[PDB]
């Protein structure tokens, strides 16, 4: 009888690189205001959020998570053919089918690497990361690319008062590579999807297929210039519920992922949560009882809401404000629509 | 100082259960030839295709991997709740998010375990194993649940020459679990992202979006009728590429799997290709020097190509028809639009 041959594994792994891409467009609340009659010291309270990137037409999820890419890369001292796989967690890339990743994988130059989309929504970075760590320990990678990247004005409602105005668009990366010393604590990591409706779209896309198509034979498009709301799906939430979930629930998620670390809350340089809300923040760092010594990023207010890319765009934005982190723990945890989540511990490149 | 903590590893992994779903409405090349003024002798020459399989509304993305899915756990002796992953590889669930995979796996119990759906096409399935195989041998999880599964027929154009005859509907799924012998060998899987545009979609659905929402609030609805061709995005191919492809670049791919696996031709049980086309197939095959004794997966000529789908419901069919195949080699390959690919050669539950 045949035995299969396997691959051998490295002790651990670790993060070697963060990259960022951020629109130039920082669109201030008094823009969006108006559509869902609110103000900007309403938003700023709310939410606190004074601005949020807003790409362009040009800046298209691939674009945007290449440019991460490229800057991960230099950081990492590596270049694309170094990567053994990229997987990109996004929502927004506009097909169906071929994935982003397969155009990100040939531009940045890691051809012939494996090349995947995710989805798991806000959670993606982290879910991204928990895949990165898993293909390393087993030897399938050396060194795993990941981008948490969306346009997600491209499926925002401006008359939507429950989430569009906290939405903004960009990329963040991370390199994962083949470590001596463990870099990368346990995953925490789940699913609730018997709350799949808390965060969704307004409808399938199938109800947009029926009614163009049905349009298009008969030659009646009622239904359509007729329509009140949008026909195209938007992003939707129970604010509230999310409130209650990303705090109260997740904080208990955050005290696993700290414990399977072993680890504890004063041997933190840094708390990473997904950028979903000030207020999910703040409220967060307080149950969690850090000492004034952790660093707590809150990028949202700048940058806004940016799902996947939330996490390392704020992780980005930390070592460029603090570069003496480099090499301390810091606590990621995100979080959103399914509802899914994924927590870590890791060593900051 | 501070040392993170590392999950214990499984010396291996292995396929423990397959299960499918298959829509009873088998379709045969009669029903499709107008449109596309064809015939039955032309499509059987062309493709091998007798029926393919189209699911009913009702038979969602969801329902059919729901399916598929408690028929593995069945097969295993396991319950939904002993599943530590689920990884549903589909290109056609109608959400940008949340995941189809966050609802599947809540249907079948195996909340909280985390859930992702993964984009890769045709070697969905492959990639979706080469992920399992990782997350067990890094001992992230113990079992995990994987799940290729498309409805088509969604996004198929009846007029369409190039693909949409080809494609059927249906879902296949297997549970890989930690081992004490290496029932996976290693993946080989890649991208060539230069070719993205080979497989694709006929345009994007932003242009979609922007069709549908201009005439929405503009009233103007030219250009929604009096569109020759659908604006509903649907699956397109350069058929001689992707064939001249796969007896290029594909064949080769596969014999790489047989030698990063230690394994040769007359090791093998079955093969069980990606059910693309029965000449591709049969060329692979005779490209192999595969021996009498080897059983070859022909499922395409009643199931039609259904993607991710085709390698599980495949192997569920040989296994249904030759129960002693249990337990013996099998050479598994996936390639679609990306391009993207993914081959193991695997050990039959």
Same mark, same amino acid.
């Given at each position: 009888?045949?035995?299969?041959?396997?691959?051998?594994?490295?002790? *651990?792994?670790?993060?070697?690189?963060?990259?960022?891409?951020?629109?130039?467009?920082?669109?201030?609340?008094?823009?969006?205001? %108006?559509?869902?009659?609110?103000?900007?010291?309403?938003?700023?309270?709310?939410? %606190?959020?004074?601005?949020?990137?807003?790409?362009?037409? +040009?800046?298209?999820?691939?674009?945007?998570?290449?440019?991460?890419?490229?800057?991960?890369?230099?950081?990492?001292?590596?270049?694309?053919?170094?990567?053994?796989?990229?997987?990109?967690?996004?929502?927004?890339?506009?097909?169906?089918?071929?994935?982003?990743?397969?155009?990100?994988?040939?531009?940045? /130059?890691?051809?012939?690497?494996?090349?995947?989309?995710?989805?798991?929504?806000?959670?993606?970075?982290?879910? /991204?990361?928990?895949?990165?760590?898993?293909?390393?320990?087993?030897?399938?990678?050396?060194?795993?690319?990941?981008?948490?990247?969306?346009?997600?004005?491209?499926?925002?409602?401006?008359?939507?008062?429950?989430?569009?105005?906290?939405?903004?668009?960009?990329?963040?990366?991370?390199?994962?590579?083949?470590?001596?010393?463990?870099?990368?604590?346990?995953?925490? !990591?789940?699913?609730?999807?018997?709350? !799949?409706?808390?965060?969704?779209?307004?409808?399938?896309?199938?109800?947009?297929?029926?009614?163009?198509?049905?349009?298009?034979?008969? %030659?009646?498009?009622?239904?359509?210039?007729?329509?009140?709301?949008?026909?195209?799906?938007?992003?939707?939430?129970?604010?509230?519920?999310?409130?209650? !979930?990303?705090?109260?629930?997740?904080?208990?998620?955050?005290?696993?992922?700290?414990?399977?670390?072993?680890?504890?809350?004063?041997?933190?340089?840094?708390?990473?949560?997904?950028?979903?809300?000030?207020?999910?923040?703040?409220?967060?760092?307080?149950?969690?009882?850090?000492?004034?010594?952790?660093?707590?990023?809150?990028?949202?207010?700048?940058?806004?809401?940016?799902?996947?890319?939330?996490?390392?765009?704020?992780?980005?934005?930390?070592?460029?404000?603090?570069? +003496?982190?480099? %090499?301390?723990?810091?606590?990621?945890?995100?979080?959103? *629509?399914?509802?899914?989540?994924?927590?870590?511990?890791?060593?900051?490149?």
């Amino acid at each position: 009888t045949v035995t299969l041959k396997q691959h051998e594994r490295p002790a *651990a792994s670790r993060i070697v690189a963060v990259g960022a891409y951020r629109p130039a467009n920082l669109v201030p609340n008094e823009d969006l205001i %108006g559509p869902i009659d609110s103000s900007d010291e309403w938003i700023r309270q709310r939410t %606190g959020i004074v601005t949020r990137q807003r790409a362009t037409a +040009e800046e298209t999820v691939p674009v945007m998570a290449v440019g991460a890419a490229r800057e991960a890369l230099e950081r990492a001292g590596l270049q694309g053919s170094d990567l053994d796989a990229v997987i990109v967690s996004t929502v927004t890339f506009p097909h169906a089918t071929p994935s982003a990743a397969a155009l990100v994988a040939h531009e940045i /130059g890691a051809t012939p690497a494996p090349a995947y989309d995710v989805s798991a929504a806000c959670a993606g970075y982290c879910y /991204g990361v928990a895949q990165a760590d898993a293909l390393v320990r087993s030897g399938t990678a050396r060194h795993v690319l990941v981008v948490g990247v969306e346009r997600l004005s491209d499926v925002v409602d401006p008359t939507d008062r429950s989430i569009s105005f906290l939405l903004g668009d960009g990329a963040g990366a991370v390199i994962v590579a083949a470590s001596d010393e463990p870099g990368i604590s346990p995953s925490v !990591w789940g699913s609730d999807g018997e709350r !799949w409706s808390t965060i969704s779209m307004t409808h399938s896309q199938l109800e947009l297929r029926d009614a163009v198509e049905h349009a298009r034979t008969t %030659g009646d498009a009622s239904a359509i210039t007729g329509a009140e709301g949008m026909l195209w799906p938007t992003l939707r939430q129970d604010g509230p519920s999310v409130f209650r !979930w990303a705090v109260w629930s997740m904080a208990k998620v955050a005290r696993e992922a700290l414990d399977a670390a072993g680890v504890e809350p004063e041997d933190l340089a840094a708390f990473i949560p997904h950028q979903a809300n000030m207020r999910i923040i703040d409220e967060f760092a307080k149950q969690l009882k850090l000492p004034e010594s952790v660093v707590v990023a809150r990028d949202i207010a700048d940058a806004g809401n940016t799902s996947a890319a939330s996490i390392p765009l704020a992780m980005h934005r930390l070592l460029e404000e603090n570069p +003496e982190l480099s %090499g301390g723990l810091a606590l990621q945890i995100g979080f959103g *629509a399914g509802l899914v989540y994924g927590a870590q511990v890791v060593r900051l490149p």
